Amino acid sequence: PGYDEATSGYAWWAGNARLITPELTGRFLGAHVAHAGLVALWAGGMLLFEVSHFNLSKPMYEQGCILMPHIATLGIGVGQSGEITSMFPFFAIGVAHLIGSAVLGIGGMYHAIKGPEKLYGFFQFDWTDRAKVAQILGFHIAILGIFALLFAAKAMYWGGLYDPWAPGGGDVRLVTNPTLDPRIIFGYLIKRPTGGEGWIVSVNNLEDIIGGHIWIGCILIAGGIWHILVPPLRWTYNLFPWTGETYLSQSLGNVAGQAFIAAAFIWFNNTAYPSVFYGPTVPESSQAQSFVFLMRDQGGLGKYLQRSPTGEIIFGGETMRFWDARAPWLEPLRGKNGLDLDKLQHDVQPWQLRRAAEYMTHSPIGSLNSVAGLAFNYVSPRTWLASAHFIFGFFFLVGHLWHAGRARAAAAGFETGLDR
Amino acid sequence: TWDRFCNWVTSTENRLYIGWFGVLMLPLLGVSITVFVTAFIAAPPVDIDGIREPLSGSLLYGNNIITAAVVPTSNAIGLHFYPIWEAATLDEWLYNGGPYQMIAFHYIPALLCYLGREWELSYRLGMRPWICIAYSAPVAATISVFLIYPIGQGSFSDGLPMGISGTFNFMFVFQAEHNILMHPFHMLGVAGVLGGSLFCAMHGSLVTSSLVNILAAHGYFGRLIFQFNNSRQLHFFLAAWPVVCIWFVALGISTMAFNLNGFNFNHSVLDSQGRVLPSWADVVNRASLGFEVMHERNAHNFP
């Protein structure tokens, strides 16, 4: 049947578009379960790869680690100031994703090869069936709302998260008082995406992060219940074609926007992405350069302190573009008008000078044509993750633009061409 | 009567299609054209570096059209939202490169609406929808230099200046910071516009030289190279090659915003003793160093 170009209409290089038809829903499932095994296979493999080549002297971000920082940020096997206690928790997490990839892989191959061509009963879905797809949207919305609360329950009770803002460096701590107050949590969404504001990327405490996830997890649960119980209403009938490739494109546009937000999040936020694990942000590493330069010379009073356009004591020079940067090592020297002159006289603990000196060597206010690095060039993990996820965000917006137009054109019936 | 407005806006009978993306485009184009022209002619100097050394970009302050630019927002603003009402005065707004942020924040959404307008008319004309995909390549390219690169660098002063000489200045400074020449995505972008020009001249020459007959047009081209022949595949490739390559070079600018820079083969070939044997990449690096030292206002790794 629908396994070649003749009876499908799609060529081999568009061969996954043969799973759009409701005749082949069972193979549609097996494509997704096998693909989720592939996602889990990398996650387990990359973590064990990162664990295998890991050396305990260099912190985490000088070793090309992007998965191990994610585990450390959950507090899994890290102590004070983000030092690794045991690598076995990292190994336990990596192996579990391998086994999960085997279960997902085996079931992905079962449905793609051995299982029925189309599902029946509760698992039979037609793309044009508005009630059934929304029901599956309801089931899936509920599950991620479940897991958002599971993440918040892990932070509140089961081991907590690594807080870089904890005093004296950083430390894993239970987030015992999450911000349930809705004007703080939803006030992040109306904050502009611009400098100094940083729409949701500027979440700078674990109480707001965990409080937001309780709000997300619950709203997703009520949304999921809403879609299981309520089929789509008549105002959502002619907004777009209710076809499979429409839904793909709407996911593509949303997931494109998500990758962009994540790329901004890894680039600017040092709360959900602590700098002891991911390295300093470029804004914060420029503050680190100027701060230790104060503590070198002395050891706007000086050549390093100017006024912001809002009139606060900031670091001067090129890094005055970075005066909105906030770091847990810098924040104890921040008074009511920016940097405090008395606190940059005698308030600075050895750990802040220790922390800022590491983050010195990470700041691109030097030379690129001899070398811009520590030893040599040094691409940071923040650079890698932000670059990769901008590329994903762009292409998926293109894929959104591709699929959305084709969805529009195929329902209206002119995706194959014009009439002579 | 609301449907009457809906009918006229979506009408494919006007001289220019407006559409819904176009009602969200002609205001944005209205602002961005007006501010650009006024600032290009008449803007006072902009303290782009934030250190009280103003840069004169406008025609009435010493420039000709070749050297004039709308100067990027001051380094003091950074990535801050700087609308006209958040300035203390009008002159302070003009001094800190306010007009550039006004232009860029209207021009970029207007292009995105031009993208959607091209989709929208093609839908209403019964066309296949992917001319807007092709146009997404220069849109992504211009967003990378006007938006993404300033965001990654932390200041709109690092954005592309809105002028001919400012653009050139942006090219050389970028090469000094980032070595875009040795970036493979820029390498792809060059192959995209030079090859895109090649295919354009070739397709133009081949088609026009067979007007009087593809059977003698493929007897020609089949003989000139080894013996497509499918006008659909050829025309897809004509669109795809400049578009895909320009996508990569736009992604190159965007990833270089995060300082994922071009290949550094400085000091990469060594002799038996460990002396650096210079290569052509080291010569390029010395050239880009010459750009870097003039653009830098304090280096901290050079006597």
Binding site: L239 | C6, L24, W85, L90
Partner: peptide, 27 residues
């Protein structure tokens, strides 16, 4: 230019709502 901020905030609200309600109608 506190009146101009209102002028811009209304102008953006009107044109965006036009675009939103334009695609809300359905064609």
């Amino acid at each position: 230019m506190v009146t101009l901020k209102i002028v811009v905030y209304l102008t953006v609200s009107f044109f965006v709502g036009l675009f939103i309600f334009g695609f809300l109608s359905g064609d």
